[PDB]
């Protein structure tokens, strides 16, 4: 009789801790099933800036009437 309430508890702490730390899982094992959804299969679209590769900067073009009309 004087062992439990001196030391520990029953189905009020070790239950609903199982219900507690098993809600840190469905936002962990499911976001890890979105990286494979997105990173490996992005793929040919390249919409989200992960496969964004630099090509050229069009700022350095010129527009003056350069001295040959047919160029």
């Amino acid at each position: 009789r004087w062992i439990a309430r001196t030391f520990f508890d029953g189905p009020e702490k070790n239950y609903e801790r199982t219900m507690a730390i098993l809600q840190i899982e469905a936002e962990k094992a499911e976001l890890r099933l979105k990286e494979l959804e997105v990173r490996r299969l992005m793929r040919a679209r390249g919409d989200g800036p992960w496969f964004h590769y630099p090509t050229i900067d069009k700022e350095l073009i010129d527009h003056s009437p350069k001295a040959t009309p047919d160029n």
């Binding site: 840190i24 936002e27 962990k28 976001l31 890890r32 679209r45 390249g46 919409d47 989200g48």
Partner: protein, 57 residues
């Protein structure tokens, strides 16, 4: 009765007159084409933190 154009000639870029239609929509100018959309969003921190293997925080 003509002029001796000493130095004023062959310089001083002018304008002439509007004679013909200006060729807008030039030689081909096919497309841009379209860009890809961006994200503005809202910078929140990590949802539970770094989610790597066990790695709580």
């Amino acid at each position: 009765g003509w002029v001796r154009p000493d130095l004023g000639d062959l310089s001083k870029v002018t304008k002439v007159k509007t004679d013909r239609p200006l060729p807008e929509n030039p030689y081909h100018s096919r497309a841009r084409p379209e860009p890809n959309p961006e994200v503005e969003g809202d910078l929140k921190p990590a949802r539970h933190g770094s989610r790597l293997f066990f790695w709580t925080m």
